[PDB]
Amino acid sequence: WSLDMLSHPQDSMELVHKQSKAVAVTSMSFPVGDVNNFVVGSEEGSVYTACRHGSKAGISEMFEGHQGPITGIHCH
């Protein structure tokens, strides 16, 4: 959401498709050091590089690797 506009989270950059499922992200933190990579880490790895918009705000360049729920998700 915007810094002044947070009456609803506007930029709903869903790091999933538009199907019918609770495709969650375990402890999906953004990248540490302000690299802004909102790593949406699903229950079976899939640490999606969920960004703001474009054709890369999700699981396109998924920086996964976690054997299980990718929870500690924050870059260097």
């Binding site: 019918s20 499922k21 609770a22 969650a24 229950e43």
Partner: protein, 48 residues
């Protein structure tokens, strides 16, 4: 004492179940029943 009353809802009825359901549909629809899958379909984008 005094027959006073607070309020409550049914969102709290599946807190840990919603956490497990979110993780289940997060990976692939984990080892749960079919009714749990239908409940996940009717609750995933409906918990608001």
């Amino acid at each position: 004492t005094g027959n006073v009353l607070k309020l409550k809802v049914n969102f709290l009825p599946e807190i840990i179940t919603l956490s497990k359901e979110v993780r289940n549909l997060k990976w692939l629809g984990f080892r749960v029943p079919l009714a749990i899958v239908n409940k996940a379909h009717q609750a995933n984008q409906l918990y608001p």
